[PDB]
Every structure is written in C-alpha cells, then in structure tokens.
Design a protein around this ligand. Sequence first.
Ligand SMILES: Cc1cc2nc3c(=O)[nH]c(=O)nc-3n(C[C@H](O)[C@H](O)[C@H](O)COP(=O)(O)OP(=O)(O)OC[C@H]3O[C@@H](n4cnc5c(N)ncnc54)[C@H](O)[C@@H]3O)c2cc1C
Length: 410
Amino acid sequence: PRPGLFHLDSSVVDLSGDDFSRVHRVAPLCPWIVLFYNDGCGACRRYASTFSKFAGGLKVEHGKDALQIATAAAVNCASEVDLCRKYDINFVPRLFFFYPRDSCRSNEECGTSSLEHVAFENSHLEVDELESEVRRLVNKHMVVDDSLKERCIDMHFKLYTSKEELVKRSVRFVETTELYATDIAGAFFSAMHYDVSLVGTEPRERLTALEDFVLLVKDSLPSIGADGVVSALESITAERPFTVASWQDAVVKSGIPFDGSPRNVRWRTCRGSSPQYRGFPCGMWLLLHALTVNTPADRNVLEVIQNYIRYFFSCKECRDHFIQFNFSPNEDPVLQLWRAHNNVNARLANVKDGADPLVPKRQFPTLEACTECYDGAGNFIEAHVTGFLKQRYLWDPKAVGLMESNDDLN
Ligand SMILES: Cc1cc2nc3c(=O)[nH]c(=O)nc-3n(C[C@H](O)[C@H](O)[C@H](O)COP(=O)(O)OP(=O)(O)OC[C@H]3O[C@@H](n4cnc5c(N)ncnc54)[C@H](O)[C@@H]3O)c2cc1C
C-alpha cells in the first residue's frame, strides 16, 4: 500500500487501472490527462508539483472553457506495475491523454465507447502549456454539448470532494434516519442544477413536464427557493432561449436552502457509508413524498411527478421502471407513492454491487419507527401509515430557514 505523490491532493485521481468505469460511471464519457510516474523518482517528485497546480485549475464550478471537462489523474508505477508495462512506461514522468472514441450528445443515451489515448510528445509542460495542450486535445478529439460538459464537471467534483474527505479524515457509521428538510432542498437543487441541464427544455412535452413540476414545488413547498426557478422558467423565449449557463445561474441565485455548495451537496438523511452511495436518488424520493403530502388542491401530483421523472430523471433504469407504475385516481397519492417506493425497496433488497452495505433496503416504515401502522400482528396496517407519512413529510417552511451551527464546517 503505497501513498504515492498525490495522496494528499484531492485534485488528482489516483488510478490503479485502465477501466474508467471503476473510477465513476460517467468517467468513460470524459477526457483524462494522466501522469504516469514513480513515487521514488526525483524528476517525478519535482514535476508532481506542476501537475498538481494544473489539476487545481480544473476546479471551476461552472466552466465556459472546454478545458473544464478534463480531469487530472496519475498512475504510480511503483504500485501499478502491470499497468505501466501495458502502456510501455519505462522512463517517467509520461503524460497520456485519454478520451472516448465518440462523444455523447445531449439527448442521446451515452453508451460504452472505445477508450482512446494519445501519448504527449513532451511530458515536461508548464501549467500554461498543459492547459493549452489539454484544451487543444479536447477540442480536436471531442464534440462537447453543454450537457456533456455538465456531465463531466459533476463527475470530477464528486471525486474531488470524496477524496478531500479521505484526506481530511487523514488528520463507526450510523445511518441518519430522521428526515431533514435540507435533503429535500438538496434534491430540488440537484434536480434543477443537474437533471434539467442534461436534457434541456425541448420538446414542448418536456418543457410542460418541467413547468408543472416546478409550479407544484413552489405551491407545495413554500420557501424552498422554487420562486426564482419559476421566474427563470418564465424567462425563456424564442428570443432568449434556454442555455445551461443561464439556467444554472438562476438556479444558484434562487436561494434554495440546501446545505453544502453547488458542487458539493450535503446530505444528512441521505448520507451513505461512502459518498458514492445514496445521496441524490434518496433525496428525490424524499422530495416526491413531501409533494404528495404537501400538495394543494386537486393538483395532479402523481401525474406531475411521473411526467417529470419521465422527461428528467438522470437514472435510466429508474426512469424506465417508474413509468410502468399505473397510478389510480381513486386512492390517496400518499399511499400509492408509498407502495411504489416499498415495491422498489423489495426489488433492491438483495443487490450487492452498487449498494450501500451499511444501509439495507427494508419495507417502510419499520416496526420500530411505526408500531401503530405496523400492527395487526403479522401484517401491515395501511390506516395509520397515512397519518405517519402525512406527519413525517409535512412541510414546515420555518424548519429549513433557521440558524445552522458553524462547526458544521466539519
Ligand atoms: C423514482 C425513482 C425510481 C428509482 N428506480 C430505481 C431503479 O429502478 N433501480 C435502482 O437500482 N434504483 C432506483 N432508484 C434509486 C433507489 O430506489 C434508491 O433511491 C437508492 O438505491 C438509494 O436508496 P436508499 O437506501 O438511500 O433509500 P431510498 O430508497 O432512496 O429512500 C430514501 C428515504 O426515503 C424514506 N423511505 C424509504 N421507503 C419509503 C417508503 N416506502 N415510503 C416513503 N418513504 C420511504 C427513507 O427515509 C429512506 O431513507 C429510484 C429512485 C427514484 C426516486
């Protein structure tokens, strides 16, 4: 177990291998600048500083510049011997550029593509020459829609922040069961900042699906910052069309009361044993239940929800299964969504790969949590389950806004 030259540097991804889907599921879609080095190499030790300064510049939160879709990574040839032999690394340092043969386009479904690479002619580049050469290589080798840009920026911020945690803790787990308003807001924020940016507002069906959803969030959940979003949605004209850049600006400016920052969203209820687990998906369920519970009028909540998931949700498999749900008009939406979710819980009960080992899926609510709706001896009582859900998901606008503790800088 060698630390290498980057162990404290959250801007650089340490690679043990060639398969970028093990880094992250979106990684194969994005360009990589890779430093092969040896941790005992003085020249490499000296250059790692330059490489690290450069990587630090791949942290812009909303980039205009296509350089920003790149991410820096490194392979320590002292640890990964087979990998370096595979690339014929003899002398170090060496810079390689990696990129997908074909680029994913906005509303196409990105598939697996062939991993391509380009050895740099000169591996001694200064920071500025590094940016120029990486930008050039990205432009030459890739077609980047705004959606793909968002895809990759989001992906490397997940890694920066996950590694920074490991670094911070380099100086036991218990699930947080209580519902926190801020998770619902994080979900709303991530829905607007990420999911909508990927697909845009076209065609008219999709734009309608989004308008209904945002309109619903605003009227269901006051003081969650949906006002600004509504305004942004209204500002779109054939004259001033949707752009990811202006959309994300308005979204950030809406003042949604999520914890964390636009590129690092803090989950509480939805925090997992590792940051790759739970988070946004867990957040979305919460937002959806809260809407069923807090919805005004005869409002079509289940219909609105399903239209949104259909045109918006960034989980392919999730989107496909949720559309298969036939929601009856009769039964209470709170109960229908509740059954749907537990249905998904059941399917997912035993999955190993991809799952948080320390957060089982159960049938919800559990005995402990609710003994009043969970009674009837050996079965489930759907009488109190409503009361429990309408209690637990009830939205109190003064819950979110209120002093938070600064020591949560930790
Ligand atoms: C619409 C939708 C469809 C999805 N489809 C898939 C899919 O097809 N395949 C897949 O692998 N993943 C799917 N997911 C993601 C997956 O369901 C989980 O969100 C994810 O695996 C993480 O689960 P979790 O352990 O954090 O709890 P989650 O399943 O995300 O639940 C989040 C929180 O909601 C509360 N909750 C749990 N059950 C209920 C309930 N029955 N009623 C009300 N509240 C409840 C709990 O507090 C829980 O912590 C989907 C998510 C959504 C929102």
